[PDB]
Short mmCIF file of all heavy atoms in Angstrom, two decimals:
data_model
loop_
_atom_site.label_atom_id
_atom_site.label_comp_id
_atom_site.label_asym_id
_atom_site.label_seq_id
_atom_site.Cartn_x
_atom_site.Cartn_y
_atom_site.Cartn_z
N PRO X 21 -21.59 3.15 -1.10
CA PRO X 21 -20.52 2.65 -0.24
C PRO X 21 -19.30 3.56 -0.26
O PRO X 21 -18.80 3.94 -1.33
CB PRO X 21 -20.20 1.27 -0.83
CG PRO X 21 -20.67 1.33 -2.23
CD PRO X 21 -21.87 2.23 -2.22
N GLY X 22 -18.83 3.93 0.93
CA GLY X 22 -17.68 4.80 1.06
C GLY X 22 -17.99 6.25 0.74
O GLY X 22 -17.28 6.88 -0.05
N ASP X 36 -18.74 -1.36 2.92
CA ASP X 36 -17.95 -1.52 1.71
C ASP X 36 -18.14 -2.90 1.08
O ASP X 36 -17.87 -3.07 -0.11
CB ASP X 36 -16.48 -1.28 2.02
CG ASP X 36 -16.24 0.05 2.72
OD1 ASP X 36 -17.02 0.99 2.49
OD2 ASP X 36 -15.26 0.14 3.49
N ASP K 14 -10.14 7.23 -0.86
CA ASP K 14 -11.40 6.58 -0.55
C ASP K 14 -11.19 5.06 -0.60
O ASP K 14 -10.65 4.56 -1.59
CB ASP K 14 -12.45 7.05 -1.56
CG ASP K 14 -13.89 6.71 -1.18
OD1 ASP K 14 -14.16 6.18 -0.09
OD2 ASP K 14 -14.78 7.00 -2.01
N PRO K 15 -11.57 4.32 0.45
CA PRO K 15 -11.29 2.85 0.50
C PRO K 15 -11.99 1.97 -0.54
O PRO K 15 -11.62 0.79 -0.64
CB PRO K 15 -11.74 2.47 1.92
CG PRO K 15 -11.45 3.69 2.71
CD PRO K 15 -11.84 4.84 1.81
N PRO K 16 -12.98 2.43 -1.32
CA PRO K 16 -13.21 1.74 -2.60
C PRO K 16 -12.06 1.82 -3.61
O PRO K 16 -11.92 0.91 -4.43
CB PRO K 16 -14.50 2.39 -3.14
CG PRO K 16 -14.88 3.44 -2.13
CD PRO K 16 -14.28 2.94 -0.86
#
Side-chain angles (χ1 to χ4, degrees):
Chain X
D36 307 331
Chain K
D14 194 4

